[PDB]
């Protein structure tokens, strides 16, 4: 059996964690919390739960993922 | 089920997050997970639609038990 | 997300999005205030096993100022102090909230009552 179109399609329901990435900040509450986090080290989103679109900064980020998994 | 977290098992906070609505305030879950409310309602609604009614003794002649379709038409 | 999946980041975005749908819900603010203080305790326990500003409870304090501005009520203001007293760490946060009670909220009986009951808490008789 051959199915057309050949290109695959993503599942219908996104599992929350993918949806969390799309949101940005417009409320003054979000701006202050957003600003205080980036001036420090803490990330906004969970790296392992939230996938990202498929040099040294990538290497240290991979180390952060290894620690978060740990 | 409503509030049984593993953070309760491994104490990390003084108090937990409180949802305002509770299961007991609502009708409750439809299923049981250990060793019926709709069934009483269906029974009670069916009971209300019965030929035996208040003033059943008052009526002098009982309505007929069954009628042919031709007579009803 | 928090108590089971242990992801503080996911719980934060769920709370922040929730306030955009319900800007005036006091229940959402109080639980969001509680959640960040829960996050701070996990970070204090994280340090003992092995940034400074959040560990002081500053990130919860930002929730305090904005929620007071949106909801101008004494009972909601006192309520945030009730959760604040529940957390033993960052007593200064309780101290900052308690001082703003009398200064900001005046001409209302409830604030004067709370100070009275706070002083309340054969020789012993």
UniProtKB/Swiss-Prot annotation, chain A:
Tissue-by-tissue expression: Ubiquitously expressed.
Post-translational modification (record): Citrullinated by PADI4.
Bilayer-crossing regions: none
Modification sites for Phosphothreonine: 50
Subcellular location: Nucleus, Nucleolus
Signal sequence coordinates: none
Entry's family note: Belongs to the UTP14 family.
Quaternary structure (record): Interacts with DHX37.
Further comment found in the protein's record: The human genome also contains the UTP14C gene, an autosomal retrotransposed copy of this X-linked gene. Evolution of autosomal retrogenes from X-linked progenitors compensates for X-chromosome silencing during male meiosis.
General function of this protein: May be required for ribosome biogenesis.
Protein name as annotated: U3 small nucleolar RNA-associated protein 14 homolog A
Native source species: Homo sapiens (Human)
Encoding gene per record: UTP14A
Full-length numbering of the shown residues: 156 to 232 of 771
UniProtKB/Swiss-Prot annotation, chain B:
Cross-link (Glycyl lysine isopeptide (Lys-Gly) (interchain with G-Cter in SUMO2)) at residue(s): 11, 49, 69
Renumbered residue ranges of the record's region TdBR region: 1-48
Superkingdom classification of source: Eukaryota
Parts of the chain that traverse the membrane: none
Post-translational modification Phosphothreonine, affected residues: 53
Record text on subunit structure and interactions: Forms a ternary complex with DNTT and core histone; interaction with PCNA releases DNTT and H2A/H2B histones from this ternary complex. Interacts with ESR1, ESR2, PPARG and RXRA. Part of the small subunit (SSU) processome, composed of more than 70 proteins and the RNA chaperone small nucleolar RNA (snoRNA) U3.
Function: Regulates the transcriptional activity of DNTT and ESR1. May function as a chromatin remodeling protein. Part of the small subunit (SSU) processome, first precursor of the small eukaryotic ribosomal subunit. During the assembly of the SSU processome in the nucleolus, many ribosome biogenesis factors, an RNA chaperone and ribosomal proteins associate with the nascent pre-rRNA and work in concert to generate RNA folding, modifications, rearrangements and cleavage as well as targeted degradation of pre-ribosomal RNA by the RNA exosome.
Record-given protein name: Deoxynucleotidyltransferase terminal-interacting protein 2
Organism: Homo sapiens (Human)
Gene: DNTTIP2
UniProtKB/Swiss-Prot annotation, chain C:
Location in or out of the cell: Nucleus, Nucleolus
Family: Belongs to the UTP6 family.
Protein role: Part of the small subunit (SSU) processome, first precursor of the small eukaryotic ribosomal subunit. During the assembly of the SSU processome in the nucleolus, many ribosome biogenesis factors, an RNA chaperone and ribosomal proteins associate with the nascent pre-rRNA and work in concert to generate RNA folding, modifications, rearrangements and cleavage as well as targeted degradation of pre-ribosomal RNA by the RNA exosome. Involved in nucleolar processing of pre-18S ribosomal RNA.
Organism this protein belongs to: Homo sapiens
This protein's name: U3 small nucleolar RNA-associated protein 6 homolog
Residues included from the entire protein: 151 to 299 of 597
Quaternary context: Part of the small subunit (SSU) processome, composed of more than 70 proteins and the RNA chaperone small nucleolar RNA (snoRNA) U3.
Repeat positions for HAT: 6-38
């Amino acid at each position: 059996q051959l199915v057309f179109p050949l290109e695959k399609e993503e599942p219908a329901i996104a599992p929350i964690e993918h949806v969390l990435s799309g949101w940005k900040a417009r409320t003054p509450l979000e701006q202050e919390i957003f600003n205080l986090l980036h001036k420090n080290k803490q990330p906004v989103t969970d790296p392992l739960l939230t996938p990202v679109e498929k040099l040294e900064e990538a290497k240290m980020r991979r180390a952060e993922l290894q620690r978060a998994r740990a | 089920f409503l509030n049984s977290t593993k953070a309760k098992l491994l104490k990390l906070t003084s108090s937990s997050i409180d949802p305002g609505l509770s299961i007991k305030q609502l009708g409750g879950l439809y299923i049981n997970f250990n060793a019926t409310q709709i069934k009483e309602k269906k029974k009670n609604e069916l009971l209300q639609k019965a030929v035996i009614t208040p003033d059943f003794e008052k009526n002098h002649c009982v309505p007929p038990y069954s009628e042919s379709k031709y007579q009803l038409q | 997300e928090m108590e089971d999946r242990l992801s503080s980041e996911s719980a934060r975005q769920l709370f922040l999005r929730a306030l955009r749908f319900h800007p005036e819900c006091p229940k959402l603010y109080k639980e969001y205030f509680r959640m960040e203080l829960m996050h701070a305790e996990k970070l204090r326990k994280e340090k003992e096993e092995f940034s400074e500003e959040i560990l002081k409870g500053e990130l919860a304090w930002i929730i305090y100022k904005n929620s007071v501005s949106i909801i101008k009520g004494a009972e909601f203001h006192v309520s945030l102090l009730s959760i604040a007293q529940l957390f033993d760490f960052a007593k200064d946060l309780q101290k900052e909230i308690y001082d703003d009670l009398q200064a900001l909220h005046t001409d209302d009986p409830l604030t004067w009552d709370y100070v009275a009951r706070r002083e309340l808490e054969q020789a012993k008789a």
